Amino acid sequence: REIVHIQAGQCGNQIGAKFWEVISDEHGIDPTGSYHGDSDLQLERINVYYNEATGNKYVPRAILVDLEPGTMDSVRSGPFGQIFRPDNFVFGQSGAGNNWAKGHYTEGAELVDSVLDVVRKESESCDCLQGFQLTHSLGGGTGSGMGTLLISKIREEYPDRIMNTFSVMPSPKVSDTVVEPYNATLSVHQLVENTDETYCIDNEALYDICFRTLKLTTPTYGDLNHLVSATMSGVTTCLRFPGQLNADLRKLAVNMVPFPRLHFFMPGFAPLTSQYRALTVPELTQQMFDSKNMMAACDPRHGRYLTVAAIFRGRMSMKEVDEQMLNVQNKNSSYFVEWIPNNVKTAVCDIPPRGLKMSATFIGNSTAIQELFKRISEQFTAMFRRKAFLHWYTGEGMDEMEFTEAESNMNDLVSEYQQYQD
Amino acid sequence: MEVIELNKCTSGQSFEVILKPPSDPSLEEIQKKLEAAEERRKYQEAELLKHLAE
Amino acid sequence: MYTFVVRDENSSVYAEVSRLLLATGQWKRLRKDNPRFNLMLGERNRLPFGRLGHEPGLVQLVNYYRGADKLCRKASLVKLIKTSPELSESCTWFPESYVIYPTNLTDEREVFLAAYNRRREGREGNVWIAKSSAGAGILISSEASELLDFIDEQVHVIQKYLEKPLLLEPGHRKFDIRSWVLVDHLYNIYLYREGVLRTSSEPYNSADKTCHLTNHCIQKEYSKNYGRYEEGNEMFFEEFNQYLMDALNTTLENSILLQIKHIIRSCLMCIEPAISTKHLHYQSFQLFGFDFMVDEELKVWLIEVNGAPACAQKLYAELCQGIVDVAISSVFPLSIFIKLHHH
Amino acid sequence: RECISIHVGQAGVQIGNACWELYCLEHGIQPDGQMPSDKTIGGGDDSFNTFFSETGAGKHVPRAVFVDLEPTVIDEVRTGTYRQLFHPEQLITGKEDAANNYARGHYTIGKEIIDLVLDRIRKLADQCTGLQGFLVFHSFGGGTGSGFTSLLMERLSVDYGKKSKLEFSIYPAPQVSTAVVEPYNSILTTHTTLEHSDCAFMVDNEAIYDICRRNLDIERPTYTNLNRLISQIVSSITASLRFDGALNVDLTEFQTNLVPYPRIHFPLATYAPVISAEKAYHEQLSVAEITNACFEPANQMVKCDPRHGKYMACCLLYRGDVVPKDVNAAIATIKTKRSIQFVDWCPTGFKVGINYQPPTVVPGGDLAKVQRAVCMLSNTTAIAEAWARLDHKFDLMYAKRAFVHWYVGEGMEEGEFSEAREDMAALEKDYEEVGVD
Ligand SMILES: Nc1nc2c(ncn2[C@@H]2O[C@H](COP(=O)(O)OP(=O)(O)OP(=O)(O)O)[C@@H](O)[C@H]2O)c(=O)[nH]1
Ligand SMILES: Nc1ncnc2c1ncn2[C@@H]1O[C@H](COP(=O)(O)OP(=O)(O)CP(=O)(O)O)[C@@H](O)[C@H]1O
Numbered sequence A: 001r002e003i004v005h006i007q008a009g010q011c012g013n014q015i016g017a018k019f020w021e022v023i024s025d026e027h028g029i030d031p032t033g034s035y036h037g038d039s040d041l042q043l044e045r046i047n048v049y050y051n052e053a054t055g056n057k058y059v060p061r062a063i064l065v066d067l068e069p070g071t072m073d074s075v076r077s078g079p080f081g082q083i084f085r086p087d088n089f090v091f092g093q094s095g096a097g098n099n100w101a102k103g104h105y106t107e108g109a110e111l112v113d114s115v116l117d118v119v120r121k122e123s124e125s126c127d128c129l130q131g132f133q134l135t136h137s138l139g140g141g142t143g144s145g146m147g148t149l150l151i152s153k154i155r156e157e158y159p160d161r162i163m164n165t166f167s168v169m170p171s172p173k174v175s176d177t178v179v180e181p182y183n184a185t186l187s188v189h190q191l192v193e194n195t196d197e198t199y200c201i202d203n204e205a206l207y208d209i210c211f212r213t214l215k216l217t218t219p220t221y222g223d224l225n226h227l228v229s230a231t232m233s234g235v236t237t238c239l240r241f242p243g244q245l246n247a248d249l250r251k252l253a254v255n256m257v258p259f260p261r262l263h264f265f266m267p268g269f270a271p272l273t274s275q276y277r278a279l280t281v282p283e284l285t286q287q288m289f290d291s292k293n294m295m296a297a298c299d300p301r302h303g304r305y306l307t308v309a310a311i312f313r314g315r316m317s318m319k320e321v322d323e324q325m326l327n328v329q330n331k332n333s334s335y336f337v338e339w340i341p342n343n344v345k346t347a348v349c350d351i352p353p354r355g356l357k358m359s360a361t362f363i364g365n366s367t368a369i370q371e372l373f374k375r376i377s378e379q380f381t382a383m384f385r386r387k388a389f390l391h392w393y394t395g396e397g398m399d400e401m402e403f404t405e406a407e408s409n410m411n412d413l414v415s416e417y418q419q420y421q422d
Numbered sequence B: 001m002e003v004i005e006l007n008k009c010t011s012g013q014s015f016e017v018i019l020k021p022p023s024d025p026s027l028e029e030i031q032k033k034l035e036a037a038e039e040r041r042k043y044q045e046a047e048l049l050k051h052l053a054e
Numbered sequence C: 001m002y003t004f005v006v007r008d009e010n011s012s013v014y015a016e017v018s019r020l021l022l023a024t025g026q027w028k029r030l031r032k033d034n035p036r037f038n039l040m041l042g043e044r045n046r047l048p049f050g051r052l053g054h055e056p057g058l059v060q061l062v063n064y065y066r067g068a069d070k071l072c073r074k075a076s077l078v079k080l081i082k083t084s085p086e087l088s089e090s091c092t093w094f095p096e097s098y099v100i101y102p103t104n105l106t107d108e109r110e111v112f113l114a115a116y117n118r119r120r121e122g123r124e125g126n127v128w129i130a131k132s133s134a135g136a137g138i139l140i141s142s143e144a145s146e147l148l149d150f151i152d153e154q155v156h157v158i159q160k161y162l163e164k165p166l167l168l169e170p171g172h173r174k175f176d177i178r179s180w181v182l183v184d185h186l187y188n189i190y191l192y193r194e195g196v197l198r199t200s201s202e203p204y205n206s207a208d209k210t211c212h213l214t215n216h217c218i219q220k221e222y223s224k225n226y227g228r229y230e231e232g233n234e235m236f237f238e239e240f241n242q243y244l245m246d247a248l249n250t251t252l253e254n255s256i257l258l259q260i261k262h263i264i265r266s267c268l269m270c271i272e273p274a275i276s277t278k279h280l281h282y283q284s285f286q287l288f289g290f291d292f293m294v295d296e297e298l299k300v301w302l303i304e305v306n307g308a309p310a311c312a313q314k315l316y317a318e319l320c321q322g323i324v325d326v327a328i329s330s331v332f333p334l335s336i337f338i339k340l341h342h343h
Numbered sequence D: 001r002e003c004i005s006i007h008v009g010q011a012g013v014q015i016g017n018a019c020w021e022l023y024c025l026e027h028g029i030q031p032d033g034q035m036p037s038d039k040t041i042g043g044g045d046d047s048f049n050t051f052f053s054e055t056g057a058g059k060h061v062p063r064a065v066f067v068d069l070e071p072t073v074i075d076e077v078r079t080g081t082y083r084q085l086f087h088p089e090q091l092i093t094g095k096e097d098a099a100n101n102y103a104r105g106h107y108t109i110g111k112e113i114i115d116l117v118l119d120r121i122r123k124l125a126d127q128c129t130g131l132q133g134f135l136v137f138h139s140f141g142g143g144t145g146s147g148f149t150s151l152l153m154e155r156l157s158v159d160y161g162k163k164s165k166l167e168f169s170i171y172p173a174p175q176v177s178t179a180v181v182e183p184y185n186s187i188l189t190t191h192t193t194l195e196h197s198d199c200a201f202m203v204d205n206e207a208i209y210d211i212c213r214r215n216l217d218i219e220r221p222t223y224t225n226l227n228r229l230i231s232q233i234v235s236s237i238t239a240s241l242r243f244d245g246a247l248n249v250d251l252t253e254f255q256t257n258l259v260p261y262p263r264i265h266f267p268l269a270t271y272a273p274v275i276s277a278e279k280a281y282h283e284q285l286s287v288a289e290i291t292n293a294c295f296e297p298a299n300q301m302v303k304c305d306p307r308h309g310k311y312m313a314c315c316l317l318y319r320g321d322v323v324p325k326d327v328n329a330a331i332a333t334i335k336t337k338r339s340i341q342f343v344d345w346c347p348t349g350f351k352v353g354i355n356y357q358p359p360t361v362v363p364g365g366d367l368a369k370v371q372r373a374v375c376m377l378s379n380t381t382a383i384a385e386a387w388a389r390l391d392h393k394f395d396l397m398y399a400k401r402a403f404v405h406w407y408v409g410e411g412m413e414e415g416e417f418s419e420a421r422e423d424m425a426a427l428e429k430d431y432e433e434v435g436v437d
């Protein structure tokens, strides 16, 4: 079961670049593509994210997309830049100017066809393609605009494959432009309709974790992206490493998504790292469900968990893992829906992440995620009610009504997340 | 408490102990519902492409 | 922290037990339909026992013993006696009783008329009584056709009437002893040291149904002398025991309680192999209310057993705490009872 | 005669792999299929030939068919120790599993492979002078075990309308769960299989898990521990078919002795004794001790309380050093203490069967070798508890239509849910009408 990776935009390629830099190490793949590990478990499922080449070389099944050549030149010049397939670099020149319209309708349109040719070529060499995973931000123009355009076009051609995304939400605390709510609202509507699984990565959460928890006075995008790498490694562990659960993207969606539109997951990770003391199983569980370890900036206690999937990594007592997991459910039983039995799933992997002996990653379909969409919606209306900055989008051919629709679709999503909270 | 039908063999024996007396569809019908499900599955798909065409 | 749910709002006893558990600060009340509980205060009718003991890492307890209806219903009690060797047909403390089905509707009609004609031809007192589980409808008559036609006019039962009841001289009235029994998950039989006497207010007349029925509702409704002698027509053991000493020159422990403790043990040991939850995936406890009646020779009789009793106002505090102490905290850690030892 | 075993889904394949392992040990068949005991190489009308065909080279080949929409589980049978037993034509695999979706295993991914499975089944059916029926191993909760099984039961009922069909079903348990939509699949597959299965043996994974923990002292039972225990019970039930005897000698007799009402065809199995092989030496239980254990809920394959449920039939299947007189004395003494209330329209009696050969165990397993063991098959109304538990979980998710879109997206209609559930409510009504006091 192969997965095709796609990274779009500055944020999409920079977090995506780190993702490959991380798992490549976890599987023992050097920057040249040669395997230099010890455990065969590293290679039992290497085909999921890597294609084997001549001379036992492992090339990521990744596609790098951007309307500017800047962020992709850095990737090629980065640590693991020589490992990516050269043909899979697809870039434009004019850029998207942090404009959703430019990425979705005008400048991305010129480039989108070329990308699908690479996607098609990768899918053709997949014995059993299970789906695609995209990394991008919703606040910019390329990853947001063009990224959703690709998702829409990929669905038209692979309607029976799972569409997964790691979607970085904008935040005024970490902001590049005031039109980020416009771009994010337009993108959210697309994700609601055309994805099965969206990992909501809120830059507000990443910032607070770097500032409050990790005690970094001035977080940099690199600091926030270290958090994203740890999470992306955690939520792909069951895919990348063998287990008794034969995990795949379709199974995750069937069990995590009770309603097709409510597929926006709150990811959490423990222990938060920027360090020699090992962490016990109860410590992982407590921190994992703690709001200070959530990557979405929502209070879980303000909502209810529809479904939860937790992954513990390292050598530990699986019996103890149960003892502490069931404890949380039985303690905070009010924060889990009572009408979905056995809505908490736990898996264990003996292989720990690089640098830690014990770790735990958490995937939560919580109705508290409505707080995030409400935050975006408020920021969106605050500008739209005065049509502020709309000329950047109407100049690219869009009409006001398309905003009013995305606004309504956003407010509707919040209402849907609310009805299931009672 | 009456043992009855004491059958015995080399590999075993069996008996009964009374303690108190007393006081499908056809192949076509299958294919009909099966093919009918793929029709709804292909119609729901066609609607998706029609929606994406818009 | 411990988890419990509530599904019986009309329970005046466990409305108090729910109060105390929360007051400890170590117990939490969830919603009635939450499957993850450590304890259930389930409803009277249709308690879903089949769904209990199936939650991983969750020791579940319930305040009702499944299958206890065989002892807390009129028809099943009489059928339990006789058919049970322990509670033989020759049960000295159980009033002679027979199960009667209405004609519109096994049945024991011809057997009732058998032991009736013997008393008429033997010059013996032949007064009987009929009642049912659908009561607030009772009839006391010396004839046969009158009681059986009243039955035709659900499953009823007819038993012999205590035509010679023990009467308290300060009034010449009839009392009714209520003893509270608690059976925990270990099937230890705990009797509450404090009981009540729903005394009457009118003089018993062996020739009207107010001086014959001693329910607190009848005394508060039909009787006018409510509260003349004792408060609320409910005497306690301390007052009663003193009257036994001054009048009959005996005590409550010997002339009455010895029999009461025997009747309690016999009934619960009889159905122990049918309701015991020792090797079961869930545990059960339950509070019972035994109603007795004492005759003039100081002999205790068994009237009925209630599965959902209501405790006296004074003794709510002392009792409902005892429920938590021995039934709820015995399995979920955070004397006023007499343990009836047995095997 | 002959019996064809069919193993569907992950649980069916793994449990079947454990059963045929135990059959080989009990029949002395080597992992290369060579049975030295057999002196009729190539032929043999013996009793064990009902489950094993004989090749010209003298190889005892199981009369089995393993099916799974995904190839990972059956590949271990192909590279396992007993790989030589089967030929590849019996091991059928797909590419994509059903993703725990009944609709995906019945309407979409199942319909692609049903025709092939039936042909492979016919390849064995034609090797049978008289075919008795089929033994179907599968899980309620799995997408393939529920969806594809029900489809096959519909088709077998057409192509083999005379042959009987017995079921070994794994009732879902949260302790070893695999998906949250398992209740949906368990209800859909029971509704679509009820009219086709002649008798079904439910195994609650909760019972096996607890039994492994308490009696075998295994902190975290694996599927291996569960399957090795389950195969012991399956062996007791199928022993009468594979060894000479007179009780339950053909598949139709299970229906006669245990299934008076066709829809109430879910006998409750109880096994004893389960002893930890870690124990150096255990106090070997007596005939009366193991018989009494048949009435302890902790030893039942489905957690329920037979006291509050009337019996309709009861078979005792002893295995080992057991003599009829011991059995009768145990039955008489257990009547007095226990409360065994049959229905008024059935005799209060027990059909007993003894096989002198002691229960076999796998070398290096967890089950100690015992000198006498018993498996009780009692068709008691108390097993309706499991249907109620399963039905309540169904009503909780379906009230909000949770996860339903996944099924309708494969072709299913929302109505088929209420149809399947209303059938389950009817089954719970039938159990009550038979168990009223
Ligand atoms: N006793 C036992 N139960 C099992 C075993 N394997 C899976 N199960 C149970 O089966 C249920 C899931 O069904 P599976 O058989 O794994 O699924 P499947 O038949 O492969 O169908 P798919 O969803 O397409 O994979 C869960 O409730 C598990 O507890 C096993 O080996 N032994
Ligand atoms: N055999 C008998 N002899 C004399 N009096 C009898 C009797 N059977 C019943 N009684 C009288 O009938 C009264 C009420 O009977 P019973 O106990 O059936 O009523 P009930 O069900 O309302 C009691 P509770 O309020 O405790 O549930 C008793 O208090 C007693 O005075």
Ligand SMILES: Nc1nc2c(ncn2[C@@H]2O[C@H](COP(=O)(O)OP(=O)(O)O)[C@@H](O)[C@H]2O)c(=O)[nH]1
Pocket (backbone or CB within 6 Å): A008, A009, A010, A011, A012, A014, A015, A096, A097, A098, A099, A137, A138, A139, A140, A141, A142, A143, A144, A168, A169, A170, A171, A174, A175, A176, A180, A203, A221, A224, A225, A228
């Ligand atoms: N976490 C993270 N967020 C980023 C990064 N770069 C930009 N962002 C965020 O994404 C939005 C800008 O999007 P950007 O990726 O530059 O848009 P694009 O280049 O046109 O696709 C803002 O909300 C930024 O805070 C990055 O490297 N990491």
Ligand SMILES: COc1cc(S(=O)(=O)Oc2ccc3[nH]c(C)cc3c2F)cc(OC)c1OC
Pocket (backbone or CB within 6 Å): A234, A235, A236, A237, A238, A239, A245, A246, A247, A248, A249, A251, A252, A253, A255, A256, A307, A308, A309, A310, A311, A342, A343, A344, A345, A346, A347, A363, D178, D179, D180
């Ligand atoms: C790759 O992503 C993952 C996939 C899976 S799975 O393929 O086994 O899907 C399942 C199966 C059963 C389930 N029950 C519930 C409540 C959720 C759930 C589920 F998601 C499990 C993962 O961790 C537990 C996981 O995390 C990284």
Ligand SMILES: [Ca+2]
Pocket (backbone or CB within 6 Å): D038, D039, D040, D041, D042, D043, D044, D045, D046, D054
């Ligand atoms: Ca032979």
Ligand SMILES: [Ca+2]
Pocket (backbone or CB within 6 Å): B024, D157, D195, D196, D197
């Ligand atoms: Ca049939």
Ligand SMILES: [Mg+2]
Pocket (backbone or CB within 6 Å): A010, A140, A176
């Ligand atoms: Mg930028």
Ligand SMILES: [Mg+2]
Pocket (backbone or CB within 6 Å): C136, C215, C216, C217
């Ligand atoms: Mg009353």
Ligand SMILES: [Mg+2]
Pocket (backbone or CB within 6 Å): D010, D070, D097, D098, D144
């Ligand atoms: Mg599978």
